[PDB]
Amino acid sequence: KRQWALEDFEIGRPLGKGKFGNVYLAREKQSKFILALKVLFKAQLEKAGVEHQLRREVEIQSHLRHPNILRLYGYFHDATRVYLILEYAPLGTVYRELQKLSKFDEQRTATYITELANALSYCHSKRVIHRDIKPENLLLGSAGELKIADFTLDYLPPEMIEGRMHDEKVDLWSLGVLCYEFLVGKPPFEANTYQETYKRISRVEFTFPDFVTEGARDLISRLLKHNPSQRPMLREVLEHPWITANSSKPSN
Ligand SMILES: O=C1CCCc2cc(-c3ccnc(Nc4ccccc4)n3)ccc2N1
Structure with missing residues (x-):
């Protein structure tokens, strides 16, 4: 349970549009670990009233560990945006x-x-x-x-x-x-x-x-x-x- 921050990542290629922002390739600076970073706008989560839906899904998705389930490593937020730290899935x-x-x-x-x-x-x-x-x-x-x-x-x-x-x-x-x-x-x-x-x-x-x-x-x-x-x-x-x-x- 390491509390992360944007400065701990180098962001790369946009992987997709998630309808609530975008998912980017990123690399963890210290470890060089490649992952995917989902970028959500906090103002668009309030005004779609899904902040609960996010919190509970993130809780569930973090504990689940199966080879055919994409890992959620963690999350963090700043002023504007919330960040999900995800497994990266090379083949899209x-x-x-x-x-x-x-x-x-x-x-x-x-x-x-x-x-x-x-x-x-x-x-x-x-x-x-x-x-x-x-x-x-x-x-x-x-x-x-x-x-x-x-x-x-x-x-x-x-x-x-x-x-x-x-x-x-x-x-x-x-x-x-x-x-x-x-x-x-x-x-x-x-x-x-x-x-x-x-x-x-x-x-x-x-x-x-x-x-x-x-x-x-x-x-x-x-x-x-x-x-x-x-x-x-x-x-x-x-x-x-x-x-x-x-x-x-x-x-x-
Ligand atoms: O629901 C959607 C619409 C589809 C785009 C998308 C993609 C990811 C994601 C997560 C991890 N690896 C990858 N790899 C990847 C590799 C090549 C092409 C595209 C994506 N992509 C997560 C959420 C997401 N949002």
């Missing part, structure tokens, strides 16, 4: 990869889905749910392993948008959404308006291109049920035939 966002490749093969998808599920299984067994399990929020390590970070309906389950009660089953719906997007190149409830997307999610209307294989259709269909109780456990996902046939890493 899954979003960008998907923009590049347009879509992913079954192997890369099934691997990603494993890595997610693993990091979620761990998350659940500390009573942590997530909401924004979306490509903008998944990063890639030097080995190209998936890392979850950043603790718009497109990825939200029916119970959530409807305003119903929700449990750890939200994250299962997310996996189905992502599994679909990874294979097809767009999420399954995509639309041109919010209102429509809302309808699509709420009545669970999705269809498959021809090229999506029977095994993947099975797993996605299983994951995207309206009824949370009907969605499989994470263990079952890791042990799905399509997953085990196509993944590269193993389940845990």
